[PDB]
């Protein structure tokens, strides 16, 4: 593996972003400092996934023993409605939820980065964001993988004048491997955030740009949406597995809950006995997965709006019930699964 015995590690899917996070550690920043620098770096160098136009979660273990979760997940706009993606006849409008301006929730990433920095960081945002800004203004080399993913997204980009301007070379030509990709408008936006903090994204000129481009293009995100965007510091979901404490993301993610649920079921077997890749072990895990995902489809959503029985789903007694239905050499077909098992 990668190794460090002094300042720790900051690891991402892009070497430029990892290097930026690692430097923050080398220069005396803490884990939250490095994570903020990485979150902005990846918004520049990994635009397939890294972002300021999306959202996410952070699970944090603090030096003092505290465990916290940060929800900076996108919100449905104020104008969002239950059937907004359906037609007259109550049928799904193909790609309405996937391609273009109506598919977007109110972005949370910038608020999320500032929130964690203000509460737990030690370095100024102004400094942590400079490496991202430099990469946007000066550019970076399109990688082999990026050339592939950009190629695949071509016909999607082509639908929107704004994306054709940002993600193609002149004449709407694909960036190729090794090309220098410069993002001047993105640097303008990051520079607003550098100077003004998150209000640089959620208010003022960038908010105006967002609101007016939404309206032009059939989206519904307004200045009111942006000014009302709120992160939420939430309790993580916590479980145990064979003497280890599991700390993961609670609603509005289902991930941490079902992670703990599935492991709870698996805990009833001595998996170590047969070892990695044994069909008997794969069967126990897969059956646990099967029940968890059935459960997910009925019980899971934003707990601010619906009742989510997290405590019941992570209860070891529930997991033991699941485990006891598992047959040595046959499955419970998915059609026979009952969410919650009654």
């Amino acid at each position: 593996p990668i190794k460090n015995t002094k300042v720790g590690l900051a690891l991402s899917s892009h070497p430029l972003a990892s290097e930026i996070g690692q430097k923050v550690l080398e220069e005396g920043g803490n884990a939250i400092d490095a994570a903020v620098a990485i979150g902005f770096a990846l918004a520049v160098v990994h635009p397939a996934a890294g972002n300021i136009g999306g959202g996410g979660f952070a699970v944090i273990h603090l030096a003092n023993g505290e465990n916290v979760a940060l929800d900076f997940r996108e919100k449905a706009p104020l104008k969002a409605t239950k059937n907004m993606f359906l037609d007259k006849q109550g049928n799904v409008v193909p790609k309405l939820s996937e391609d273009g301006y109506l598919a977007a929730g109110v972005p949370g990433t910038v608020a999320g980065m500032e929130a964690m920095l203000k509460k737990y960081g030690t370095k100024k945002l102004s400094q942590l964001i400079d490496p991202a800004i430099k990469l946007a203004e000066n550019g970076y080399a399109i990688s082999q993988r990026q050339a592939e993913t950009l190629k695949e997204a071509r016909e999607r980009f082509l639908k929107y004048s704004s994306s054709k301007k940002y993600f193609f070379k002149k004449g709407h030509l694909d960036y190729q491997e090794g090309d220098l990709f410069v993002q001047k408008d993105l640097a303008k936006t990051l520079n607003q955030i550098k100077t003004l903090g998150a209000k640089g994204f959620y208010q003022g000129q960038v908010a105006e740009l967002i609101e007016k481009d939404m309206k032009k293009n059939g989206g519904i995100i307004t200045k009111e949406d942006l000014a009302s965007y709120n992160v939420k510091w939430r309790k993580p979901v916590v479980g145990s597995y064979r003497g280890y404490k599991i700390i993961s993301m609670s609603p509005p993610s289902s991930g941490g809950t079902h992670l703990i649920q599935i492991l709870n079921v698996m805990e009833n077997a001595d998996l170590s006995a047969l070892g990695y890749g044994a069909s008997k072990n794969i069967h126990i895990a897969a059956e646990a997965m099967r029940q968890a995902y059935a459960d997910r489809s009925v019980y899971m959503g934003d707990a601010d709006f619906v009742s989510v029985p997290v405590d019941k789903l992570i209860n070891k007694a529930y997991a033991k019930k699941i485990f006891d239905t598992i047959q040595p050499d046959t499955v419970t077909p998915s059609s026979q699964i009952k969410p919650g098992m009654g």
Binding site: K3, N91, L209, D329
Partner: protein, 188 residues
Amino acid sequence: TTHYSVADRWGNAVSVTYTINASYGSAASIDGAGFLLNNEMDDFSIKPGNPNLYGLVGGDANAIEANKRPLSSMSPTIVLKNNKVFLVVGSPGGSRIITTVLQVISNVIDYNMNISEAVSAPRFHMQWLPDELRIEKFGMPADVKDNLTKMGYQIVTKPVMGDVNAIQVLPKTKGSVFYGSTDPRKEF
């Protein structure tokens, strides 16, 4: 989606998964601002029983409402041993995130893999609907596949799942050693 993991000398750990959902989000950017818009709305159930981009289904609980946050599968996770940081782990992959992350954790805990081994090891996936056992190329030999098919799994080989960036922390006489793995898969 993309996941990143950070751990420092003072004992803080930060595990972040964040996203614009699909590869390049909604594919639409904000004119004048230079950034792509998420298509996170597809993480809601847009019609009961309708499968989204990851084959995930829903009803009331994950219905769209004003201001509501769409249901996620993201699983940034920290594992503690004796209250000290042990693993910092997460992955992208929509519905596959939960199963990717649990397999990495199980590989370390149940099988005593180091973090590099834990991350590289082939991954399987069951998400109830579709009713299939998803595996990776070269990941399961004939003997295992035949035994699982006999139990009644429908096995399918599909593109590799996830892109785990994980840290393992181990105590040393003075301080700690930090071990890392990136994922040889790069899904996104």
